[PDB]
Amino acid sequence: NSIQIGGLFPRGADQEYSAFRVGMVQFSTSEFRLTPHIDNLEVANSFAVTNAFCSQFSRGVYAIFGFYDKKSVNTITSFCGTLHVSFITPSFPTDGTHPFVIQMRPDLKGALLSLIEYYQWDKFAYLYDSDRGLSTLQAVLDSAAEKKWQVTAINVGNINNDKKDETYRSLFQDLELKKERRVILDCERDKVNDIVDQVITIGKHVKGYHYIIANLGFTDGDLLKIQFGGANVSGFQIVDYDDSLVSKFIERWSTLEEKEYPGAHTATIKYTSALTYDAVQVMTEAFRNLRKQRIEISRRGNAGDCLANPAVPWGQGVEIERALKQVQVEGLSGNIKFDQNGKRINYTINIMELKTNGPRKIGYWSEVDKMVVT
Amino acid sequence: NSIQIGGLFPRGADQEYSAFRVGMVQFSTSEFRLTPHIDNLEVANSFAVTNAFCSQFSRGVYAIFGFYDKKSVNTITSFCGTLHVSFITPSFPTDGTHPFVIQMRPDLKGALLSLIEYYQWDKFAYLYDSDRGLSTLQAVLDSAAEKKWQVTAINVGNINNDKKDETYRSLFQDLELKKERRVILDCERDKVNDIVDQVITIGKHVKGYHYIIANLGFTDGDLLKIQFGGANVSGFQIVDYDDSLVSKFIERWSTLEEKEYPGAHTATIKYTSALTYDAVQVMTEAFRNLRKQRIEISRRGNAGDCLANPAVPWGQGVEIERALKQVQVEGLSGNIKFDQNGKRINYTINIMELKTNGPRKIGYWSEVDKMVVT
Amino acid sequence: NSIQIGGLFPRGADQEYSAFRVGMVQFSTSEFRLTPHIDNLEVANSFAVTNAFCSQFSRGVYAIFGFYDKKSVNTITSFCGTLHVSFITPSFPTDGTHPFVIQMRPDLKGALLSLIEYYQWDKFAYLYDSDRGLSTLQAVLDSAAEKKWQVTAINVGNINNDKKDETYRSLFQDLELKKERRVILDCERDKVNDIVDQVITIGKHVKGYHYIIANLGFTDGDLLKIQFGGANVSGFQIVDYDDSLVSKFIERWSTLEEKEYPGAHTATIKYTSALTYDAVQVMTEAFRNLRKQRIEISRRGNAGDCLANPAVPWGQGVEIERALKQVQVEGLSGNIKFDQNGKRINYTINIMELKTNGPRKIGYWSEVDKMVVT
Amino acid sequence: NSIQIGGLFPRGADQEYSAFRVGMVQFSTSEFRLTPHIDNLEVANSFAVTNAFCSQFSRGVYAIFGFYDKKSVNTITSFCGTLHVSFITPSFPTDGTHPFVIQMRPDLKGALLSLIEYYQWDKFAYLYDSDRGLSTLQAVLDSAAEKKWQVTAINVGNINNDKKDETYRSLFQDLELKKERRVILDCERDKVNDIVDQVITIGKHVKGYHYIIANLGFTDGDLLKIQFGGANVSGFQIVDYDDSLVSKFIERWSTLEEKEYPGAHTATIKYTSALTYDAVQVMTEAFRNLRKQRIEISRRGNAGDCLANPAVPWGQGVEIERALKQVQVEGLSGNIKFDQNGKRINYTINIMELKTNGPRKIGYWSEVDKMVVT
Ligand SMILES: *[C@@H]1O[C@H](CO)[C@@H](O[C@@H]2O[C@H](CO)[C@@H](O[C@@H]3O[C@H](CO)[C@@H](O)[C@H](O)[C@@H]3O)[C@H](O)[C@H]2NC(C)=O)[C@H](O)[C@H]1NC(C)=O
Ligand SMILES: *[C@@H]1O[C@H](CO)[C@@H](O[C@@H]2O[C@H](CO)[C@@H](O[C@@H]3O[C@H](CO)[C@@H](O)[C@H](O)[C@@H]3O)[C@H](O)[C@H]2NC(C)=O)[C@H](O)[C@H]1NC(C)=O
Ligand SMILES: *[C@@H]1O[C@H](CO)[C@@H](O[C@@H]2O[C@H](CO)[C@@H](O)[C@H](O)[C@H]2NC(C)=O)[C@H](O)[C@H]1NC(C)=O
Ligand SMILES: *[C@@H]1O[C@H](CO)[C@@H](O[C@@H]2O[C@H](CO)[C@@H](O)[C@H](O)[C@H]2NC(C)=O)[C@H](O)[C@H]1NC(C)=O
C-alpha cells in the first residue's frame, strides 16, 4: 500500500522542498511510502494554481500540500470546499474559517498585542505589507480603539523600491518630528532585510527606537547588523533551538550537502521548512490512523475533472479531513493540534529580544495563558 | 454582423440585467447584433466563476461582462491576462494594474480626501466593510499619517444579520465616549441603510453630527428617513439627473413594465446599472469601430478548453483591448475615456449635500482639478 | 335558557369581537347560556347607531354592548335612559352622569394630574385630538389655573393624510421656538404612532425631552422605536401582564390563530378588548345573580317599537341596571366595581416608564390614594 | 303652491315662535302658502328630537326648521345628510361641513380675535360653557400659541346655582391671583346674567376690569346692571336698530300685543328671532325661485318612514339645497349669502361699547375687511 499526493511549490523555493524530502525519507514507513507528484509554479498566478489543482485532481489524489498567496487563497479554499479535498499549507492563515484546509502556521495577533501591552506601548507606527493578509492590521486597529492608542498605519508594498528611497527619508523625518520611535514591521523577510538596510544606511536606530518584527523568522534574517546598535529590537520565534528534537534534526540537517539538498548545509532554518517537516509528520500520522481504523479511502477510479458540473464530492475526503483535525503531535514548531475548522491550537511562541551578545529568549506566549516572562 | 459575448451576473442583480437588456435593445442596430450568453451565479464562489469563465470561453466569445468581489477578483484578472480575453465590469477597481480588464467605476479615494480637506477634519471615524476591499482605508490612513489626523477605523462586515441591532448601538455609544461627531461610511447600500436606521433609532442624526457616504450611490439609498434630522450629510454622485441624457433615459426607463424589466418603474437608478448601460454602449462602439476598420475578426470553434497546457491565447484579443480602451464617449456616468491600464480618466464626481428640501449638487471633483465649490 | 343580547361594533374592530367570543366561551355556561346579535356599522354615524339600537330593542334584548364616539354618545345615552336598556361599553366615559350606562373604561384625568405634579412641570404642551372628548383638556386647564402653569394646547385631529409630515414638523418647530421639551399626548394608538414616527424623523426623542402617552394603551403602541433614544417616556397601563389571570389568559390567547380569531396570536392585547372580555364576565355575573334571586325577567310579549309614543319603559330593565352596578369581580383591568352612576371605582392604574431595557413599572395610582412610587 | 314644512322648538321658546309667525305673515305670498307642523320639545334629548324628525318625515315634509344644542346636533346632521332633507337653524354652527344644513347664525371667532388684537391684549381670561361647542375655545388657544398670549381658560357650565356663591367667589379670587383685569365670557344669556350679578356682588365691576360678551346679543341682558362703573365693557351686535328695515319691523313688533304674540311688545329682539324672520324670508324666496324655474317637486305622505333599511333619499331634495345655498336677500341680519357648505359669507357685524350713557356702535367687522373705526 502507498498513498499518492500532490505538492505545490513556488519557483525559487529550494529549502522547503529539501525539508519536505528529508521528512519524507525520515518518516517513511515501510508499511506504506508516499508518492508525491510535485508542481513548481508562481503561486500568485491563480490560473497556474488552478491548472495544477485540476491536474492533481485528475491524477486521483486524496490530499494536497503546497503554499498559497494572497492572490491564490480564495480559489484554493473554494475548490477544496466544493470538491471536499484536503489542502495542507504552512502559509498565512485565512481571513476566516475555511473548511478542508490545514493551517500549520499559528496566528500572531495574540502574542503581538500581548507583547505590546507588556512593553506599555501607546503610540507607534505599523509598517505593513499586503502579503500575509490584513487581519493583524484590523486587529491592532480594534485594540487601539479599545486602549486608545495613537497608532499610525503605513503601507510599503505599493511603493516602488526605486522611488522608495526619498519617501523613506520623508516619512522618517515625519516620525522624528512626531517622535514616532516605536515601530512594527509586518512585512516579508526580504522586505525586512531591505528596511534594516535602509535604516543602517540612515543610522536612525539610536537608543529609544524599539523595533518589533511581526513574523516568526526572527533569527532567520540578518540581525548581527543591529546587534550592537543599542536599538531595542524584538521578535518572535516558533522553532526552539533548545529542545532535543530540533537539535538532532539540525544536526542531521547541517550535516547534509548543498548539492542534492540546497539550503541545508547551515544551522539557521526557516520556520516554513520546519512547518513542512511537521506537515509531513502529521500527514503520515493521519494516513497511519486511516489505515489502522480499517478505513480504506482508496478511490477505485480517477477523481475525474475539476470543472465538471455538477461538483463530484466524496465522503472519504470528509473522513480524511476529520482524521487530520483529530491529531496531537510534536514537531520542530512545538505542539501540534487543530480545532474543528483546521487552525492550529495549543502552541507556544518564544519571544526574543536582541542584545549585544545576541538574541535571548525573554519569555514565551501561549493561548491558555498570556505572555510569560522567564 | 452578429457578435457573441458573455455575462457573469450574480444571483440577486435584477436592476443590472434590466439595464443590460435596455442597452442591448437601444444601442443595437442593423450593422450587427450582440448575442449575450448570460449566467446568474454566486460571484464569491471562485469555483463557479472559473467554471462560467471556462464555459463562456469554450463557446468562442469575444469578450465578457460581469462582476466580482474581493474573493473572486484575482481569478478573473489572471484568467483574462493569460487568455488575452477582455473583461468589462462596473465592480470596484483593481488595486493595481491589470491587462484585459476594463473598469467602469471611477476611483473614489481622491474625491474623498479632497472633500475631507474641504471640511477641514482632523479627528473622525471610518466604518469600513471588509467584504468590499480596503484600498480606500489604506489611502486615508496614509494621508492621515501625512497630515496628523485621528482616524478611528472600525469594521462592520463580520456583523451577522441575526443580532446586528445592539452591536451598532454599543458601537455608537463607544464613539460618543470618544467624542466622535464626524463619521465616514465606506459600505454598500444595504449596510449604510441599516446603519442609518440604527442611527435614527439611537437618535444620532440631529444637528452637531456629520456623515459621509463613501459611495457613488448617494441618492440610491432611502436618504429621506434622515433628510429632516438636522445633521450635516455629504456624499458623492456619478449620475447627474439634471442632464439631458439621463432625463431622456429616465423617460423610457420609468415606463418599462417593472414586471417585465424588474427594478425599472421609477426615476432612481443604481450606479451599477448605469455603468452596465454605459458598458454595453462602449462595447458596441468598440466593435463598431473595429468592424469599420477593415479588420478580420473571425473566430471559429477553435478555442475548446480553458485549462489547455500549455495555455495559448489568440492574438486577435489584443486588438479588442486596444479598441476598448480607445473609446471617448458620453453616457449616464458622464464622460468616459480609458487609460492604458483600463482605469477611467477625465471623469467628474458630483459632490452633493443633503438639505431639508432635498439633495443638491454643491460641487464637482475631478482628477486633474481638485474639489470645486459653487 | 338562552338570554338574548345585542352587540355594536365598528368596522375595523376585530380584536375586540375576538375577545368578546373568547369571553362568551370562557364563561359560557354557569347555569344558562347567552346569545348575542351583532351589528357592525360606522359608529360615528348616529343614523346607523339609531337603526341598530332600534332593531335590537325590537328583538327583545335584555342588554347591549358596544362602542360610541363623541358624536354618537348622546343618542345612546338618551335612548337607554328613556327605554331603560343598559349599555355596557369600553368607550370614553361620559362628560357627566347618565343612567342605564355601564362605562367600563376608568377615568384618566386624576392619574394624569398626579403624574404631572410628580414630575413637577410648570410649562409644557398638550396635543389633543377631537376624537374622544376634551374633558381631559378642560380638567388640565382648570388645574393649571389653580396651579399657575403654562400649557400650550394643540389640536392634531383636523388634518388629512396628505400634509401630515409638514403639519407635525411645523408644529414641533413652533414648539422648539418656545423651548418646550415636555409634552402630553391625549391621542390614540394611530395618532401617537404617527407622531412618534415624525418626531423620530426630526430627532426629538433624544435626551432632553419628555413625553407622556395619555392613554391606557402604553405597551399596545410601538415604543421599540424610541426605547433607545434617551428621552423620558411615561405612560399608563390598566392590564398588568405580570399577573396571574393575565398570564393564563395570554397563554390561552397567543395560542390561537388569526384566521378564526383575528388579532389573537400575539402576546399583547389592547385595553379595549380586555375590557370587552371583562364586560362579558360582568354581564354573566349579573344575570347569574338575578337567576339566583329568582327573578323572571321574561317579557310578557314583544318589546314593541323603538319610537312608540308615549314611550313606555319596561320596569324590569331598572333591576338589570342594578345587577350591573352591584357586581364586584377581579379581571384583566383589575378590581372591577361600579358606582351608582355606572362609572368605575376602587381601580388601579399602573404607571410605566420606558427604560432602555424595556417598559418597567414605577408605581400605581388609585382614586383614594394619589400617585404612589416604587 | 301649498307646501308643508316642519318646525322644532324648545319647551319655553316664545319670541322665536312669535317671530316665526310674524314672518310667515309678512311673507305670505298670495301665490303659495307654507303650512307648518310645529313640535315643542326638550331639544337637549336626542330621543325626542329623532322622534319629531321621524314624525315630520312621515307626513311628507320638504324642509324643517328648528334649533339644537351640543347634545342634539350630530343627530340632526346625520339624519339630514342621510335622508337628503334640509334643516334650517339659527343655533350655533357646526364644526365642519355638514350638508343639508342651513346655518343662519354667523360665526364669531373672526371678529372676536380681531377685537382682541384691536385692544392690544396679551394676557387675559376666558370663561366658557359646554353648551354651544368648544370651537371658539380651540381657535382662541390656537391664535394664542400663534400670537404668544397668556390665556386662562375656565368652564363655568358644570356648576349648579346654589353652589355658585362660594364657587364663583373662589373662582374670582383665584382670577385675581394673576390680577386679572381682562376676561371674556363665551356663555349663554342666563349664564352671563348670573355672572355679572355675582360680579357686581363682589364689586369687581370697577374701572380697570374689562369684560367682553362673546355673543351677538349685546343688548338683551342687564346692560345697565353693570353699566354704571366706567368699567370697559364691549360686545357684538348682528342687528342694527337704526336701519330703516329694522325700524319698520320693530314699529309693528312693539305695537303687536303680547297675548297672541308673546315676547313682542318691546323694542329689542333676541337675535334668534331676527334669524328666524330671515329664515322664513329666505325659505319663501327659495320656494319661489323653484316655482319660477318650472320644477315639480311633488311630495306627500308617501315617502315612508325614517328607519327604513336601506334608507333611500329622493332626488328632488338635493335641488332644494341648491335652492337655499344659492339665494340672497337683505333682512334684519343684513346681507345673506351662503356657501356650498351652508354657512354665511358676507355678513357685516357691528361692534358696541358700553358707557355710563349707554351702548354705542364702535365700528363693524366683516369677512374680507377686519375691524373698522368710525
Ligand atoms: C528598551 O529596552 C529596555 C530594556 O531594559 C527597557 O528598559 C526599561 O524598560 C521599561 C519598560 O520596558 C521602561 O519603563 C516604564 O518606565 C516608565 C518610567 O520611565 C513608567 O512610567 C512605565 O509605566 C514603565 O514602567 C524603562 O524606562 C526602561 N529603562 C529602565 C532604566 O528601566 C526600555 O523601556 C525599552 N524601551 C526603550 C525606548 O528604551
Ligand atoms: C455643518 O455645515 C455647516 C455649514 O455652515 C458648518 O458650519 C460651519 O461652521 C464652522 C464653525 O466652526 C465654520 O468654520 C469656520 O470658519 C470661520 C471663518 O473662517 C473660522 O473663524 C472658524 O474657526 C471655522 O474655521 C465653517 O466655515 C462652517 N461651514 C462653512 C461651509 O463655512 C458646521 O460646522 C457643519 N457641522 C459639522 C458637525 O461639521
Ligand atoms: C427626564 O427624566 C430625568 C430623570 O428622571 C429628569 O431629571 C430630573 O429632572 C429634575 C428637574 O425636574 C432634576 O432636578 C433632577 O436632578 C433630574 N434627575 C433626577 C434623577 O431626578 C428630567 O428632568 C426629565 N425631563 C427631561 C426633559 O429630561
Ligand atoms: C379701557 O378703555 C380705555 C378707553 O376707553 C382704554 O384706554 C386708553 O387706551 C390706550 C390705548 O392702548 C391705552 O394705552 C391707555 O392706557 C388707555 N387709558 C386708560 C386710562 O386705560 C383702556 O386701554 C381700556 N382698557 C382698560 C383695561 O381699561
Ligand SMILES: *[C@@H]1O[C@H](CO)[C@@H](O)[C@H](O)[C@H]1NC(C)=O
Ligand atoms: C474630457 O471629456 C470632455 C467631453 O468629451 C472633452 O470635451 C474634454 O476635452 C476632455 N478632456 C481632455 C483633457 O481631453
